[PDB]
């Protein structure tokens, strides 16, 4: 969208693996 | 008298205007009012004396900048009331202070006196018909959809992570400081000077703030860069004369989470955030880990996300899900939640009115926000 | 109805408000004669002024009253105005206001001697003192830009943006067109031209107006001057006599360049620009580099810009866009100036009056100056 | 290897010399190298053509003067490395390097760079077996006996406070700013242009110093002296020409209070002092208010100390016990306390080996230092 400052593929989270 | 209300998102480095039920907002401008240094002997300058906006941006040079808030705390209350003016004005906004409803926000536990006198100018300076003032984390949630979130936000001014869960904002596991984006920008300033290059003047202090938006990133260990050898990348000025900056680049950032940096013992981003998940109930514990929210502009540091899981990897109990989300729209987040509570039918019962605002007075201020 | 007074070193350039080009134009001379005891025919001015001086040359002994921008001899500075007022304008100076021009960095008293006169012995209804450089960018037309303003009595930059000036800036410069002339005069006396008098002083001033030029690279033309004759041009004087001079065209005007060999031990002109540009605030430099305005007579070489836009940019950054104005009509630029500043209705409240002359005193001018 | 060490207390204006348990420095000499501007046509002339010390100042007139050193940075470091060469060799202290330790000093917050190049300059040009790189605060307060206080220091190239409580100097609370008698002489001389008596050759400018030196005095309230007319005393020149000073004098050294005036927004001497003690924590700033030490040759003013007193008093906070002490010798405090800290026997331990660098390199001297 429109505005000066974005950031480009850092992703939206950053999550630990679920384990069983 | 209801009217589209206005959304004026504060802060000491940023201040975003705009009216509500909007995507982004369309009035963004750095919060800081310039006055000329120099004498104006050539008519046909700059006139006003009084530079806001875009107009300050582009004639920094001829500038002395002054910032009227630190810390989500405005000192010099002459220079935001010309800001809000500004902003109200035909240059921006390009309506009355009459006509809308106005929603303004704070950071958490600050003074009661500067949220008085706030309110003071808004109803009286300005002729306000309704105000509401509000938190950042209520806010940044109202944007993601969420109601259950740790909003672990980093601005120019505070740095703080309010744990809410289900609509349920705990005053007493909030965790604040004052180290943020500023003191960074500051603390890499002393660094250059080191390095070599001095930077003085406050029209000359946004340059370091440029270098800092542009190249920096947070080491995932601090300890192997320092043995290591840097590259020393280059950057170049509006002048045209490069600047190694070495390795000031990933040890200014390191304020953030090293306090004891620029010489004053306080938690830390990563301290903060545990403490605040700590201090709530212990059932509430497993969802605030799993719902952490990033906001902010010093949350945009390149690898800041990653290093922010490694160190409550290290701190928080073993085998539990962390996950620290963060939107496309970070630096908006707070504003956007604004236009979203503005637009909402329940706004009308939440504000501060003007009736009973000369009724009352400060109590009904410090009654309905909580 | 204002009456522009460009009191210069060399020439002295006057007229009247709102004009395109001056009307009184001439050499800033009195000539006083040879006094023996023996009588002389038919009656005769005891001290001649301006192009009479200029005219019975070989007799007089030719004083400039101003030396290096400073008045030395008052009394011969009050008899050049009465020569401007009465004798080439053909009118007085009570009805008229009075704008005049004085280069930066000039001792305080000269402005309160210059206005004690114009008030006290001229009684004139309303005067000002302005800058050269400021004047001279007005008439260029900009707000924004330095200007390495050079004329016989003094070179001196003003870096100004926005039309906002930086006092702290400007950076005055002992060389001038007059030690140019001396130079020329003594590298004549090297190869068999000697003159002494100050009757060739005018002489050699005209060889320097006519033949010199600026060097592009200076080794390069040396060179070429020991090896082909076809660049040794020959110049007839006053007198039927033809002189022939080979390396003196481009070594003359190198003095600028190269104050070592006048023996002043300062910056040249194409460094003391770039250091009055560092001087000024960081983010303000590339509208400088942009607008590097010319004026004076000491800027009518031929090949004068291509030289600066070589030795600036050789100076500076490799990013930067060097640009220099050099218009046609850079000799009378503060003058030109003077007029548009006289035309304007805003100039019309910033005048200097009678009544607060005997207020005040000659101390009120440096408040209204700058 | 453990010979008499020595003592070279660096600075931009003056250099001093000698050895360890010294009661004064044998060897005080300006930092500067003299070269000649005329041409040697006869013989038995002064050989060299590089002239250092009381040579250089004896023959002024003849030198092209030019200071290595500005505001503790060499820029000029060909010349810096040829004053050290002259301060070892026979004409002052008549002694080989390989054989003594060296005591360095430097000012605080300089460019890391020079501190590696300076002793790249100690280890390998000349054969240093140890070095050690010291501050100036740490010295004066080893001269005086002390442990507390803050150390305001002046000379001629950096003003700078550092805040020491009980041997624990505070890196965060060090406040500096280029604004010392170097910038004060510089504008002393644009003031005495203002006034009439110009100066500009090199030589020339050593004249003013000797003028700010004798001449002049700073008045506690500044808006009283400027309402007042001055009464214009004389100063004799090395030539004989008598100059009426006028309002030059006072307004001069101003500067270091107000450094608006030369065009430079910093803090000021009174600023820095006060700031430096508001840097630092609660509980030290009473007992650093108690114990201030003045040091260098611009806190020599006439009327400095009682301005400094004022100041203090309209910044600190109410009824608090200031006192603003000083050594007699306030030239030589900080040489003094290095050679007293030269002799310790600790003294071993603190430096840089020769072997130790050549191991390490860079990093052991930025582990030694600080």
């Known amino acids: 969208m429109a505005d000066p400052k974005y950031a480009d593929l850092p992703g939206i989270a950053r999550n630990e693996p679920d384990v069983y | 008298i209801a009217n589209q209300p206005v959304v004026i998102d504060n802060g000491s480095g940023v201040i975003k205007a705009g009216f509500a039920g909007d995507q982004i907002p369309k009035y963004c401008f750095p919060n800081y009012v310039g006055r000329p240094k120099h004498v104006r002997v050539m008519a046909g300058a700059l006139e006003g004396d009084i530079f806001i906006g875009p107009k300050a941006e582009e004639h920094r040079g001829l500038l002395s900048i002054r910032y009227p808030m630190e810390h989500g705390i405005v000192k010099d209350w002459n220079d935001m009331e010309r800001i809000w003016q500004y902003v109200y004005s035909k240059e921006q906004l390009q309506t009355f202070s009459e006509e809308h409803p106005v929603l303004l926000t704070e950071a958490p536990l600050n003074p009661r006196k500067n949220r008085e006198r706030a309110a003071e100018v808004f109803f009286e300076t300005f002729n306000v018909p309704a105000l509401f003032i509000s938190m950042q984390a209520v806010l940044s949630l109202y944007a993601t959809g969420r109601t259950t979130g740790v909003v672990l936000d980093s601005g120019d001014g505070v740095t703080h992570a309010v744990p809410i869960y289900e609509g349920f904002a705990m005053p007493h596991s909030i965790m604040r400081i004052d180290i943020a984006g500023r003191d960074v920008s500051r603390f890499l300033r002393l660094y250059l000077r080191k390095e070599g290059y001095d930077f003085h003047s406050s029209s000359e202090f946004e340059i370091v703030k440029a270098i800092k938006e542009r190249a920096c990133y947070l080491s995932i260990n601090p300890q192997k860069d320092e043995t290591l050898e840097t590259e020393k990348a280059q950057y170049y000025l509006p002048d045209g004369s490069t600047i190694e900056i070495g390795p000031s680049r990933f040890r200014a950032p390191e304020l953030l989470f090293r306090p004891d940096l620029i010489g004053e013992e306080s938690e830390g981003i990563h301290e903060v955030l545990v403490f605040a998940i700590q201090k709530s109930d212990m059932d509430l514990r497993r969802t605030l880990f799993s719902n952490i929210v990033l906001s902010g502009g010093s949350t945009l540091f390149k690898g800041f996300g990653d290093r922010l899981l490694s160190e409550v990897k290290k701190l928080a109990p073993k085998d539990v899900k962390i996950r620290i989300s963060a939107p496309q729209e970070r630096l908006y987040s707070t504003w956007i939640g604004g236009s979203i509570l503005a637009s909402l039918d329940t706004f009308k019962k939440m504000w501060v009115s003007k009736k009973e605002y000369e009724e009352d007075g400060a109590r009904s201020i410090h009654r309905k926000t909580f | ?370």
Not at chain 3, 203 to 221: P, S
């Open chain 3, 1 to 370: 109805a204002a009456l522009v007074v460009d009191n210069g070193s060399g020439m002295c350039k006057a007229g009247f408000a709102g004009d395109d080009a001056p009307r009184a134009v001439f050499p800033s001379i009195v000539g006083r004669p040879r006094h023996q005891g023996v009588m002389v025919g038919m009656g005769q001015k005891d001290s001649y002024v301006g192009d009479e001086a200029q005219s019975k040359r070989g007799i007089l002994t030719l004083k400039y009253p101003i030396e290096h921008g400073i008045v030395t001899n008052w009394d011969d500075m009050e008899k050049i105005w009465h020569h401007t007022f009465y004798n080439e304008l053909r009118v007085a100076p009570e009805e008229h206001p009075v704008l005049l021009t004085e280069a930066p960095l000039n001792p305080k008293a000269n402005r309160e001697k210059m206005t004690q006169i114009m008030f006290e012995t001229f009684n004139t209804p309303a005067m000002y003192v302005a800058i050269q450089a400021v004047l001279s960018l007005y008439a260029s037309g900009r707000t924004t830009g330095i200007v390495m303003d050079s004329g016989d009595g003094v070179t001196h930059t003003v870096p100004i943006y926005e039309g906002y000036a930086l006092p702290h800036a400007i950076l005055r410069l002992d060389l001038a067109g007059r030690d140019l002339t001396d130079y020329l005069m003594k590298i004549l006396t090297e190869r068999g031209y000697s003159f002494t008098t100050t009757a060739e002083r005018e002489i050699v001033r005209d060889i320097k107006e006519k033949l010199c030029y600026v060097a592009l690279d200076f080794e390069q033309e040396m060179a070429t001057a020991a090896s082909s004759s076809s660049l040794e041009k020959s110049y007839e004087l006053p007198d039927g006599q033809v002189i022939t001079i080979g390396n003196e065209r481009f070594r003359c005007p190198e003095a600028l360049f190269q104050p070592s060999f006048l023996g002043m031990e300062s910056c040249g002109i194409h460094e003391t620009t770039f250091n009055s540009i560092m001087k000024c605030d960081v983010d303000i430099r590339k509208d400088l580099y942009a607008n590097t305005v010319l004026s004076g007579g000491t800027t009518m070489y031929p090949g004068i810009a291509d030289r600066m836009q070589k030795e600036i940019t050789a100076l500076a950054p490799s990013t930067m866009k060097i640009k220099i104005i050099a218009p046609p009509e850079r000799k009378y630029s503060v003058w030109i100036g003077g007029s548009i500043l006289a035309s304007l209705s805003t100039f019309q409240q910033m005048w200097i009056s009678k009544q607060e002359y005997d207020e005040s005193g000659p101390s009120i001018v440096h408040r209204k100056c700058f």
